[PDB]
Amino acid sequence: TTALVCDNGSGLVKAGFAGDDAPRAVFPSIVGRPRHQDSYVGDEAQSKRGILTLKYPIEHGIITNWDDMEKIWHHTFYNELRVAPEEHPTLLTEAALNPKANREKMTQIMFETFNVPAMYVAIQAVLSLYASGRTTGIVLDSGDGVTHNVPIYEGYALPHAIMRLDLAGRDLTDYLMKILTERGYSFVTTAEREIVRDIKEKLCYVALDFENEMATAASSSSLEKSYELPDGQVITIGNERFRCPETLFQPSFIGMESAGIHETTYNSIMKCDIDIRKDLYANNVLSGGTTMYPGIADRMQKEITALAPSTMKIKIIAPPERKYSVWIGGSILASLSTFQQMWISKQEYDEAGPSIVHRKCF
């Protein structure tokens, strides 16, 4: 009996089998319908992106279109992994601070629609911490929809200190689209947005000193990069390379008044008991695709050093495979019989209904 591990991101599904060192299926969490006003899922929607408008059933880590989410899950099981879900205990994941109804409906659909034999809903950042080989640390998890800070001590998250921002990779893509169109390059359709997300992933980086980098970019072309578009036209991008992820540190770039990721991390540590802050400062673990910008660890080290006591050891841990850390932590825990012991069985769901998820999944 092999458990399935599915990390349902706002942007990407990561799915596979407990015991594997990586997800076997990674594909966009999208359902596509004709742009001219019946549907396609994931890679096949991406393949027909020329004629489709792409919709994401998860926004900011919360499922907002349950009919389309069912399509995503059905596709994951039957078309990608090619498994019968009634044969596999299934581990799902969630960002911290989601409304309780989200995992209630996750549980209901898994048992009543897909007839899984057992299931569990795990907190994403906890999975990442175990994937890093730690029981104590503060995870900064940043994907396409959610950025959040989860401090954890001796294996237990500290719920009063958890922070969350609706700023993440989708906002960075949109901001790159906006500022590139301001250079003279029109990107507007959901199809062109795909090109912009690729530009962001290939060419953006976090400047160590943003003001200095802006001056460098205005003086010479040393920071410019070329990028070949599908039609073969070559465009040149310059300070957009680092202005885009600067938004993570300066959310006012997109008109948000909230704290940047260095400040939310500091504020989260500061909500913890004084004597464990030391261990959190030395164990800042980055997780998720939006933490993949070159330079982001060094910039976080610099910014947190400026906020923290001068005598404090600061360390940012940036695992190379952190696009998949949440999934990998799930694969490890789902390989352990004692963790499996806490999962909800179909018999338990039949007796208790969706409310049981809150009594079993921590």
Next chain:
Amino acid sequence: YNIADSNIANLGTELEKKVKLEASQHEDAWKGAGKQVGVEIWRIQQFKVVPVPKKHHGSFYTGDSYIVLSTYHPKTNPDKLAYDVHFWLGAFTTQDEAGTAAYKTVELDDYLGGLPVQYREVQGYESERFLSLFPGLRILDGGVETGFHHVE
């Protein structure tokens, strides 16, 4: 985002503790652990917690991850037991081994009522406390194979 009516409203509760305490009852490695002063050692082997024979305690494969439970009498009571639980991560241990050692350290902590204080001991960064357990630390080349299947 607030805690009320959210998926973290049941964290830090007596219910969470009860559920995790029960789960820890299903690991054979913990039966009889921490019953007298001394050092007990297990190694992760393809996700399993495997006891290390006493005669080999203090020798660690650089390719592997271990759990080391140090049971001692606390200053507060010479007839009671207190616990430090160290997990030792070899320089060449794989991600499945280190993650299992971390999770199972928390589980042993749960099993012993939360009393153990946890210590992460990376090879080359071992705490003075850990060094003091072997008044004789020996590092061996090699180790057991990962429990992960490698996805090509």
